[PDB]
Amino acid sequence: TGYLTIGGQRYQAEINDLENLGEMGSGQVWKMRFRKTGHVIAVKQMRRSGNKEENKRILMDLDVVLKSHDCPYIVQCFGTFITNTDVFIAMELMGTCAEKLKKRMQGPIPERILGKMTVAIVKALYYLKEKHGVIHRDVKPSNILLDERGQIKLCDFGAGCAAYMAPERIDPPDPTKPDYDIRADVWSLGISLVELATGQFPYKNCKTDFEVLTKVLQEEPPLLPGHMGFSGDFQSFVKDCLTKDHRKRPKYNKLLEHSFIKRYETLEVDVASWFKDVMAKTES
Numbered sequence: 125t126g127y128l129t130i131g132g133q134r135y136q137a138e139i140n141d142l143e144n145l146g147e148m149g150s151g152q153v154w155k156m157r158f159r160k161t162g163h164v165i166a167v168k169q170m171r172r173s174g175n176k177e178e179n180k181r182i183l184m185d186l187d188v189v190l191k192s193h194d195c196p197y198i199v200q201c202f203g204t205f206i207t208n209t210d211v212f213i214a215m216e217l218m219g220t221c222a223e224k225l226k227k228r229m230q231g232p233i234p235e236r237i238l239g240k241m242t243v244a245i246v247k248a249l250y251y252l253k254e255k256h257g258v259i260h261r262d263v264k265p266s267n268i269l270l271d272e273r274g275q276i277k278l279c280d281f282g283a284g285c286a287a288y289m290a291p292e293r294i295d296p297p298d299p300t301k302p303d304y305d306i307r308a309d310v311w312s313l314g315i316s317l318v319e320l321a322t323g324q325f326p327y328k329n330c331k332t333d334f335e336v337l338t339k340v341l342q343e344e345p346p347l348l349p350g351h352m353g354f355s356g357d358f359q360s361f362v363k364d365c366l367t368k369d370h371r372k373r374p375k376y377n378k379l380l381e382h383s384f385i386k387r388y389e390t391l392e393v394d395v396a397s398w399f400k401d402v403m404a405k406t407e408s
């Protein structure tokens with residue numbers, strides 16, 4: 125009926141072996157308890173479509189995550205249940221995402237955390253490209269998961285305004301070869317880092333979608349501000365990510381040589397204590 129693979133063991137399981145502990149999203153996501161082991165997991169319910177080429181597209185995506193167990197920086201999938209109407213996708217529970225951390229913080233996430241985040245997300249994206257030939261296409265804070273153990277992982281969860289699309293994805297310069305590649309995700313990462321480092325959307329004061337898309341195309345990229353004490357290597361990293369000319373934008377292997385990443389690979393940062401200190405903080 126469905127198989128859950130948890131901790132090297134494959135359990136036969138039915139949809140009723142899952143006890144519902146409530147919703148986590150707002151497609152629908154539930155916190156559930158697998159009755160056989162007691163594990164508390166995250167489960168996404170999606171409607172299946174009548175288009176069997178679209179069902180194939182989404183199962184191909186999940187196939188990738190199912191085979192991404194050897195990447196420490198990609199959220200773990202335990203398996204799926206398929207009915208006529210629905211696909212249930214079961215994952216390790218991560219406590220929250222960087223989008224919800226920002227709203228709880230009401231302000232910036234510190235650089236030492238974003239440094240660790242950056243190492244994890246770049247390595248996850250690189251892994252997806254190198255091992256599975258796959259581009260994420262939707263890098264943004266709501267797809268960056270954090271937990272109590274200090275892990276940071278890439279997922280796909282499903283005035284001022286959000287916009288994460290690279291210029292070449294908004295408006296391809298070559299109509300003959302219109303496909304954006306991995307550098308579009310590099311840009312999205314840059315935008316995500318600026319948003320999380322500042323606590324504010326980088327593109328500000330926008331009336332319409334057409335205005336916002338227009339801003340990305342003609343404005344200078346919004347870099348980290350220079351008055352907030354950000355390290356030179358962090359500013360350089362973000363600026364390299366937010367190169368408008370995609371032909372000049374670094375690929376992942378180049379980003380993995382950047383000083384910012386090298387520094388945060390080996391620096392001890394207690395993300396777990398910070399995360400907990402954040403969740404337990406009683407000053408408003």
Ligand SMILES: *CCC(=O)N1CC[C@H](Nc2nccc(Oc3cc(C(=O)Nc4ccc(CN5CCN(CC)CC5)c(C(F)(F)F)c4)ccc3C)n2)C1
Binds near residue numbers: 216269278
């Ligand atoms: C902001 C989020 C939030 O509020 N919360 C609250 C708590 C919740 N925790 C949690 N923990 C684990 C999982 C989860 O949500 C889910 C996520 C997935 C999931 O990540 N699915 C996938 C699917 C596909 C991919 C890879 N694709 C490659 C192709 N491209 C397009 C071409 C798309 C991506 C991935 C990836 F990237 F590899 F990781 C992930 C599934 C189910 C659930 C429940 N929430 C977070």
